[PDB]
Amino acid sequence: GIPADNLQSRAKASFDTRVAAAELALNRGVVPSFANGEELLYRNPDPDNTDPSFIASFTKGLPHDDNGAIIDPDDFLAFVRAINSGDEKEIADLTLGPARDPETGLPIWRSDLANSLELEVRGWENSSAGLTFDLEGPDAQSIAMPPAPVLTSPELVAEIAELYLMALGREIEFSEFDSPKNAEYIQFAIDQLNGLEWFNTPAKLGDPPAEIRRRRGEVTVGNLFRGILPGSEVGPYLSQYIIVGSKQIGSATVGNKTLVSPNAADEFDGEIAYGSITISQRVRIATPGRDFMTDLKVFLDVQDAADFRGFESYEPGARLIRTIRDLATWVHFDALYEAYLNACLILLANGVPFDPNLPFQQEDKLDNQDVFVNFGSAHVLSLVTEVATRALKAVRYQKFNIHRRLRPEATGGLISVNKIAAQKGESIFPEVDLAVEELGDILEKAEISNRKQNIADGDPDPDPSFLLPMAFAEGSPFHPSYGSGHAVVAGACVTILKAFFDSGIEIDQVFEVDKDEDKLVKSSFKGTLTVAGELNKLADNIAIGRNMAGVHYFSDQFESLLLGEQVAIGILEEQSLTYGENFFFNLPKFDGTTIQI
Amino acid sequence: GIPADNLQSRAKASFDTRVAAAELALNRGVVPSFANGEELLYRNPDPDNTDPSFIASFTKGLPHDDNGAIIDPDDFLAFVRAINSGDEKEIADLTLGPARDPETGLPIWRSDLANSLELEVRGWENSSAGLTFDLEGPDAQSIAMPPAPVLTSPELVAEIAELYLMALGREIEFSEFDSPKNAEYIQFAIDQLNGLEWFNTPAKLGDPPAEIRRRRGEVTVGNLFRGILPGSEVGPYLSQYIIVGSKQIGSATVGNKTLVSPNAADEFDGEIAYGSITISQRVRIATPGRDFMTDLKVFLDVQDAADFRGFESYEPGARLIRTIRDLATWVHFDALYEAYLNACLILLANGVPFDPNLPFQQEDKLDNQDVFVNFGSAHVLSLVTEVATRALKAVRYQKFNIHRRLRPEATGGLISVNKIAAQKGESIFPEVDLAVEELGDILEKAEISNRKQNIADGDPDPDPSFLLPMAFAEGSPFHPSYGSGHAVVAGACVTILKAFFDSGIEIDQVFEVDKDEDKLVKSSFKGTLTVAGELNKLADNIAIGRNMAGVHYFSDQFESLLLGEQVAIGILEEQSLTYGENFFFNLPKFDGTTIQI
Amino acid sequence: GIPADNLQSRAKASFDTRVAAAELALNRGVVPSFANGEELLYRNPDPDNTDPSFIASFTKGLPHDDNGAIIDPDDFLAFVRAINSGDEKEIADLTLGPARDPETGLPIWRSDLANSLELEVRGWENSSAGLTFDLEGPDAQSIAMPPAPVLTSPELVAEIAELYLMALGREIEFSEFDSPKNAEYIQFAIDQLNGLEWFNTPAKLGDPPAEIRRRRGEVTVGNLFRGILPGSEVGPYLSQYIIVGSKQIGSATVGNKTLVSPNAADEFDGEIAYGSITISQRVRIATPGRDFMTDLKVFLDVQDAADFRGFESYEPGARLIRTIRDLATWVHFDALYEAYLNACLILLANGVPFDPNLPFQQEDKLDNQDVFVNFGSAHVLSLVTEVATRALKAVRYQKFNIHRRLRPEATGGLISVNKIAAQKGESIFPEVDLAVEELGDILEKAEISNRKQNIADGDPDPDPSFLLPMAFAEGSPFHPSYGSGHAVVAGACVTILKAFFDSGIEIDQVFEVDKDEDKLVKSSFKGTLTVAGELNKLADNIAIGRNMAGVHYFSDQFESLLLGEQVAIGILEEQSLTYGENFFFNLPKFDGTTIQI
Amino acid sequence: GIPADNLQSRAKASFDTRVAAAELALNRGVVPSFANGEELLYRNPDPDNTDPSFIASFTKGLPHDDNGAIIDPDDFLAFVRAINSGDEKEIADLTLGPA
Amino acid sequence: NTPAKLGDPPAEIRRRRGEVTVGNLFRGILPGSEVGPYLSQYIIVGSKQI
Ligand code: VO4
Ligand code: VO4
Ligand code: VO4
Ligand SMILES: [Br-]
Ligand SMILES: [Br-]
Ligand SMILES: [Br-]
Ligand SMILES: [Br-]
Ligand SMILES: [Br-]
Ligand SMILES: [Br-]
Ligand SMILES: [Br-]
Ligand SMILES: [Br-]
Ligand SMILES: [Br-]
Ligand SMILES: [Br-]
Ligand SMILES: [Ca+2]
Ligand SMILES: [Ca+2]
Ligand SMILES: [Ca+2]
Ligand code: NA
Ligand code: NA
Ligand code: NA
Ligand code: NA
Ligand code: NA
Ligand code: NA
Ligand code: NA
Ligand code: NA
Ligand code: NA
Ligand code: NA
Ligand code: NA
Ligand code: NA
Ligand code: NA
């Protein structure tokens, strides 16, 4: 008899498809996640106390002493227990915030500002979302981020130096990075970083492969404050997709005729055609020169859960992203998939082709088939957005269940307290001795910046402060540093977009924000940019925007991007079981190689 | 790796296909069947006897008293037990027939006629066929008919009135329903039925949905004695397929040439070309005006299993169906699939196209493929016949295991005994008081009809009798009333034919039986009939033929048609797993909607 | 504890029953089918062409050269590919018919007749039905027919000789086989066949068992043109069931009284009581002496798909089968199950008992149970018809997927072309040299017959032609020779009927068609015929009728009968799982042994 | 012993969760979809043509006559076949647009 | 201008509309569509700003 397959009911076929996808996911296997060892390494400095200090762990929300170290190790250990169980009652039992006034029930803050505002506490944002399963893609716990840099490492010294330089450079305009008027500061930044071992010495044989992949070399104006995804290094700092508008309704080719939108100019003034309405690329303008958490009392209140959310001031209006601070503002409030949805909408409006390896992408006279639900606009619009929550579950596992890395503000706190004590001949947080020594010149500038801010804030004679100035009043979100929500979602979303579109398409016109006016101008860039390159750049823009705000380190971002790529790939692989057509997505990965899914 | 399926051996693929079909059938779920409550409602009228009477249940074959009520309730309860077990020995233990003569062993009958014939008993026909499984289609027990009308209901009153009117109208010619010569009787029938609540009052919100679907309105000459399937109501009473012949061998189109059969006229004289031989549409002629079971003793003997089968007389010859009695004769002896096989053969000979959604139905120059074994004549010829036994198992379950509804003759027996007693001021079977009151005028006519028959049968001065005259000497088959074998098979078979053919095809010429001669004449009908419509009409013709014989009620037939439709649909659904081709059947269902299988 | 079984839900019991039946079918195992090796044996005779010629394979529809060999081997190889895949688009891509006129799109035929008719092509009838699964019975591919006779074999020589003799004997009346007026021709036929090795020499030890079973011996008037099923050899040529009518409505035994139908005579004039209507055994009369495809151009057009269906002429009226040609006509247009349904109806009307090993077959006073749905008339009427499609799937596999044997007309084509060429000293189709030499006398007669037909057809000076005259204008159906649709269905259907009835019942009166008038007469046969014997004879009648038309060989028929028997047996075996009763069918098989199922 | 549940690996728990969701969806059962009957109801108005007209069916893209009725019913029937198979080559074989 | 009747398809009964008014002209029948202005707030209003 002739070998054959058999049919079954549709319902059973659907069930079997779902089981086959689950089986595929299971058959990938799992890898462990390894932390860097700091959590139980660092011990209480008191000679009659053997307890861990937890100074390099995220402890935002647990009560801290005047040095910024948690008061009671049990507070953190219970937090860890609650992280791994996810039980809501157990979460509700944790210690959050400082001691409360028995008469009013309100937290008693250190700072006059916090007490005058009568601030309440804010809580951890989904501390157990790393336990949540998902109907599609790799399970949150099945993949790993590598150990975070330790406080004593050249990598961390380089990272924190860079964050201070970004903070002090917040009023610099992207289009003026190489302007003579900025040369003193820009060259200072370049020279400072080039003076650090991470940047001026290569990795050595036997170093962790993850370190080798992410380690940076000579700093230049051309790479200053940039990411390392392929494409980020070519042409202007900001991705085309975060400044340009799109082709507008009324511009179209109809047979042999070209119609021109009466609104065509809007493309070149940052208006994205969003269906039949518009998205403006112009960002709200946070008060220039105003930073936060530059006073130790306010800083400690924030570390103790003081809810400063909503405290920023703004100038009227909006403008195409101009300064480093503007990029920080952008990423303060974006929906996490916002940049990539917006890029997708520009690509669609501009008529950038889908992946030619999808079905039905030929002229309809040849294939008798146009695309929409599958392999078309509606498909990619759902797919780019749906991956975000799956990527976030995975990064939550890394953030809370694995690494619990302290946020940059916390590192800056240790540095400040250390430096102040050393000036009096005392050693506090020797763990950051190297950063304090290496960042001397930068910290001198930060001190001056902080005094100015402290005086502006109404303290006529402020204590010296070397804190990392925050772009946001509340500093970081209420979750650990490593990895990043923004960067994991960036990784997943741009992965989908490169997969779905013909990512090799070359962009015709390249723009930048004008040096003098709030408008786009032709870039002086002479090469060719591609969709793939500018999507990678967009991911790096959003990710580094968090660093420029003071809330993530370089390694948080890069490693998160890689994690999000894995999530999106796995979703595509499992979904491929569901289609009858013969096709694949061509995906250029972050590592420079291509996978067909 | 690229997702894939794998091959297996032919044998395993066949096995898996069969399992998948069984799985599909299992996954349909099952529904319960609900009886109307009469079985244990009606009690023995004797004040010292609390037993059920079972007067509204089928008890044909169990010994009855002089009123037609069973003598011993244990007889019926044992019958029920035997129905549910199917054990042959247990069946053989039941009580069947009246007491026997110890000298001859023969049953002792009430009637001189039965004793003179020395009749023996007949037994129940497959009382446990409702337990039989099947290799294809829905299991007999998986589907349901709704509760039957109760004796006290307006519906039952209407039903039994209609049956008496059919009995008294047996010598009326279909083609003369609206002839002035028949106006007195026809108007009597119309007026009587229009005087009944079922017909003259609509269903009300909250009535059972099944009642709402089958309830009839104003009776007219145009709908008198018709069914309600879509198509039955348009044009002449009898389906084309039970009177017309077909195209004959020798009539064909060969390229550009038309050849004409030397036997072409046979088409218009009721000859179906049956391969290279013929089927004659002409029915045998039962003696006009001769009815049966109009004497209470003969009636009770039949109730007590007296085997009167074969006792009818006939005139010589045969004729195209002319009278109501002729349709009764037709359905006395037909193979249950006979009408539909015959219709199928007419459709095939006349070249009516198969469903255009089947494969290979195009001219062969386009598809290189003609049809026969699959999607062609041999296919439909097996499929239309094979569904009959599967449908019959299902209706057996309803008949014997669920509802056990008394046959119309039994209802007429209660009515007659009641009315005779009431004339003497006594109350017997008050359960049918409403029917007796409502049917007064009809019963007056039946009394006169019965006296004439009783005299003809050799009783010079017969007792008054109000029994429902039977077309058949033995009355009903030896099984309960609800549902009907004929009607369930009708439902299943016409379902197959509408599915398999292009049922939307419009019929070119419409015929009727001539008013004066045994011949076809062109119908005066002005509209358009369709294949689907005339197949539905055929099903209603066969089903109502049983009612005209006196053996089923309207509700038995309609509900059975629906049950048979479900059986045929399920068979098609399970069979669809077996083909490699890309196709479906388009099936217009009885409810006016279409399913693609 | 006492060992026990348990109940489950009805629905699960139904499912398990179906799975158990599938398991039973799977556990039978499978056997391979072996072809005779001709397909790649015979090669193109051109010395510069090594390709197979495919001359012994069915290639009807593929374009042929002037000798009747296909023009392009790729045409046949693609046909084979399409056979095994069943893909409708692939089927639509095949080459069918000769080159077409670019102006009209019509095929360009060789013959004036075909061009004058403007014939189109006809396509293959379900070339992939051998891939179709079934819900019941053995899978189409699980069983086998043995290799067909090869062109060079004594068996094939005997087979083709017999077919020519039947063609030349088409006007001989069955009742006059032994009449002195027919003696010259009849003795010629007997002597010719007795001169052939197949008939005059026994099989030898080591010959294939299938050959030994089907090999025939001495030809006599008593076995001339008969089949070899047990029963075919006893009494008159034609089965009682293809000439007699049945008992008629109105003839019945009612208690101690015998009633006689006023239509009783119809039984003895070929009227089958078909419910309350009738089937006439009288067949349409194809023009005596008119054969087809006797001209090489017309023959080649038919081989190239010219659709001559419907081209025959007939005399007015109908008659009980009289001549060999009448049996050919019978089987031209019968529904494949028609003969056996008709026999079943005769058996039922005549009151022939069902198998006594079925339940409930006793008088009802003993068993309290009559039969209808199961073990009765409705049961057998569905079962005999349902087996036909299952048997046809199996024979399609053998026809198309396995053996692809050329039809007899094609063999006659090779013989004619060979003989014509040899007369000019050339060798064409040496493969049929033996047939040409052995059939010399027969071919001389065929030549004369063909010239007469060619002149009648309007060719005043026809080329010599030794083609096998066809009874049908289109010759064979559009599918290979081995096996036969008619014969496989015959095998399956008579198997069911012998199983279901008491096949040992002896028939009381034996009839034949009168020598002078169109009526039945008492046979002079002195022995006893049985139901089983006359059912076997009926199967052989239908099968050999195809051979008498010129469309099958002896071995096609016999082997098909055996295949159909296997299908029906397997259906009965699987269905036996579905009943609760204690019974079996007693089945006398074709090999003379009995199986109880 | 006290009745208990057991743990398994995270990976197996994820797999089992996904299967349980598929099982839930399967256990909902399915229902058929019924069309209104127009597709084969309406016939070609020409007295020598018994074909369906398909006038109440979506036929946008198939060639239409001057009245807006499709020219060739086979165009629509092939479209239906392609709809139910999804085969790209089969789709590419359909008739789209006028001559 | 005529209501559905007993025995009509349930789907018809659910979606069948009655008397047309300026207040329901060209509106849908989802609960809430019938109250207040034609257009949903969410297709004309802006939101609270940063
Ligand atoms: O949303 V973030 O993890 O980039 O703080
Ligand atoms: O064959 V019936 O159940 O219509 O009495
Ligand atoms: O229907 V046949 O295979 O006897 O040509
Ligand atoms: Br399903
Ligand atoms: Br987040
Ligand atoms: Br990968
Ligand atoms: Br196999
Ligand atoms: Br029945
Ligand atoms: Br349905
Ligand atoms: Br159940
Ligand atoms: Br066949
Ligand atoms: Br066997
Ligand atoms: Br695990
Ligand atoms: Ca396209
Ligand atoms: Ca065709
Ligand atoms: Ca019996
Ligand atoms: Na210590
Ligand atoms: Na301001
Ligand atoms: Na791509
Ligand atoms: Na500027
Ligand atoms: Na009582
Ligand atoms: Na056909
Ligand atoms: Na249909
Ligand atoms: Na008349
Ligand atoms: Na050669
Ligand atoms: Na003639
Ligand atoms: Na038998
Ligand atoms: Na004669
Ligand atoms: Na028409």
Contact between chain E and chain B (3 or more Cβ pairs less than 8 Å apart): yes
**Residue B297 · residue B111 · CB < 8 Å:** yes
For residues A519 and A517, what is the distance between their CA atoms, to the nearest angstrom? 6
Per DSSP, the residues of C235-270 read: S-SS-GGGT-----TT-EEETTEEE--TTGGGGGGT
Q: Residue A7: beta bridge partners?
A: none
Report chain D's C-alpha Rg in angstroms.
Answer: 25
For residues A346 and A16, what is the distance between their CA atoms, to the nearest angstrom? 38
**Total Cβ atoms within 10 A of residue C549:** 27
For residues B375 and B355, what is the distance between their CA atoms, to the nearest angstrom? 9
Domains of chain B, first to last: 1-597 (1.10.606.10)
**Residue C72 · residue C49 · CB < 8 Å:** no
Q: Distance from CA of residue B511 to its chain's centroid?
A: 24
- Cβ of B551 closer than 6 Å to ligand 2, yes or no, is yes
The reply to whether B3 touches chain A by the CB within 8 Å rule is yes
- Cβ of B405 closer than 6 Å to ligand 2, yes or no, is no
- What 3-state DSSP class applies to C64? strand
∠C406-C410-C415 over CA atoms, to 5°? 125
Cα A374 to Cα A377, A570, A579, distances in angstroms: 8, 18, 9
**In sequence order, which ranges of C43-182 are alpha helices (DSSP H)?**
73-85, 88-92, 112-117, 154-168
Query: What token pair was written down for A195?
Result: 């003076």
Packed helices A10-27 and B10-27: angle between N→C axes, nearest 10 degrees? 110
Shortest CA distance to A508 belongs to which of A176, A267, A230, A229?
A267
| Closest-CA distance of chain D to residue C89, Å | 8
**Residue C469 · residue C550 · CB < 8 Å:** yes
Per DSSP, the residues of C469-536 read: -BSSTT-S-SS-SSS-HHHHHHHHHHHHHHHHBTTTPBPS--EEE-SSSSSEEE----S--BHHHHHH
The reply to whether A372 touches chain E by the CB within 8 Å rule is no
Cα C304 to Cα B466, C2, C44, C81, C98, distances in angstroms: 74, 74, 19, 20, 6
Per DSSP, the residues of B16-49 read: HHHHHHHHHHHHT--------SHHHHSB-SSTT-
For residues B53 and B410, what is the distance between their CA atoms, to the nearest angstrom? 14
Per DSSP, the residues of B285-332 read: EE-TT--B--SHHHHHHHHTTB--TT---EEEEEES--BHHHHHHHHH
Tracing tokens 């070399």 back to the chain, one arrives at: A217
Query: Which of C337, C540, C542, C546 most suits a substitution to test ligand 3, by most atoms within 8 Å of the C-beta?
Result: C546
C401 contacts A2? CB cut-off 8 A: yes
Any idea which residues of B carry the catalytic annotation? 479, 486
In C, minimum Cα distance to A1 occurs at C141
- What 3-state DSSP class applies to A323? strand
Contacts of C89 in chain D (CB under 8 A): 89-90, 93
Taking every pair of Cα atoms in chain D, the longest distance, rounded to a whole number of angstroms, is 84
* A254: alpha, beta or left? (left if phi > 0; alpha if psi -120 to 50): beta
Query: What token pair was written down for B211?
Result: 């009642």
Residue nearest to atom 1 of ligand 3 (CA): C485
**Residue A520 · residue A512 · CB < 8 Å:** yes
For residues B299 and C212, what is the distance between their CA atoms, to the nearest angstrom? 65
* B367: alpha, beta or left? (left if phi > 0; alpha if psi -120 to 50): alpha
- Is residue A303 marked as binding? no
Scored b (16 or more CB within 10 A) or e, C362-377 reads: eebbebbbbbbbbbbb
Residue C479 designated active-site: yes
The reply to whether A104 touches chain B by the CB within 8 Å rule is no
**Residue C25 · residue B15 · CB < 8 Å:** yes
Q: In chain E, which residues are followed by a C-to-N distance beyond 2.5 Å, i.e. a gap?
A: none
- What 3-state DSSP class applies to A501? strand
Tell me the residue type at C255.
Answer: G
| Closest-CA distance of chain C to residue B597, Å | 16
Packed helices B440-456 and B154-168: angle between N→C axes, nearest 10 degrees? 40
**Residue A487 · residue A546 · CB < 8 Å:** yes
Per DSSP, the residues of D12-46 read: HHHHHHHHHHHHHHHHT------B-SHHHHSB-SS
Per DSSP, the residues of B536-587 read: HHHHHHHHHHHHHHTS--HHHHHHHHHHHHHHHHHHHHHHGGG--S----EE
For residues C575 and C569, what is the distance between their CA atoms, to the nearest angstrom? 10
HSE-CB of B437 using CA atoms within 13 angstroms = 11
Of D32, D52, D81, Cβ closest to residue B504 = D52
- What 3-state DSSP class applies to B448? helix
Q: How was this structure determined?
A: X-ray
**Residue A536 · residue A494 · CB < 8 Å:** yes
For residues B111 and B100, what is the distance between their CA atoms, to the nearest angstrom? 14
For residues A429 and A418, what is the distance between their CA atoms, to the nearest angstrom? 6
In E, minimum Cα distance to A333 occurs at E50
Q: Which residues are within 8 A (CB) of A425 and not within 5 positions of it... i.e. 6 or more apart? A: none
For residues C145 and C563, what is the distance between their CA atoms, to the nearest angstrom? 7
- What 3-state DSSP class applies to B513? strand
Q: Which atom of ligand 1 is nearest the CA belonging to A476?
A: 5
For residues B443 and C588, what is the distance between their CA atoms, to the nearest angstrom? 57
Tracing tokens 């000679």 back to the chain, one arrives at: A47
For residues B590 and B231, what is the distance between their CA atoms, to the nearest angstrom? 10
Cα B397 to Cα A208, B144, B488, B543, C229, distances in angstroms: 76, 9, 12, 19, 42
**Residue B367 · residue B389 · CB < 8 Å:** no
Taking every pair of Cα atoms in chain B, the longest distance, rounded to a whole number of angstroms, is 96
Reported resolution, Å: 2.2
Tracing tokens 């402060």 back to the chain, one arrives at: A465
For residues B376 and B573, what is the distance between their CA atoms, to the nearest angstrom? 18
Q: Distance from CA of residue D2 to its chain's centroid?
A: 53
Contacts of A284 in chain E (CB under 8 A): 49-50
User: Is the peptide bond between C483 and the residue preceding it cis, with omega within 30 degrees of 0?
Assistant: yes
Q: Using CB atoms, which chains have 3+ pairs under 8 A with D? A: A, B, C
Backbone angles phi, psi at A43, to 5 degrees: -115, 155
For residues B376 and C123, what is the distance between their CA atoms, to the nearest angstrom? 13
For chains B and E, what is the number of CB pairs under 8 angstroms? 8
For residues B21 and A233, what is the distance between their CA atoms, to the nearest angstrom? 60
Q: What is the dihedral of CA A377, A378, A383, A389, to 10 degrees?
A: 130
**Residue C596 · residue C357 · CB < 8 Å:** yes
Cα B225 to Cα B169, B209, B541, D47, distances in angstroms: 10, 23, 10, 34
The reply to whether D41 touches chain B by the CB within 8 Å rule is yes
**Residue B554 · residue B483 · CB < 8 Å:** no
**Total Cβ atoms within 10 A of residue C85:** 15
Residue B70 per-residue DSSP state: B
**Residue E4 · residue E10 · CB < 8 Å:** no
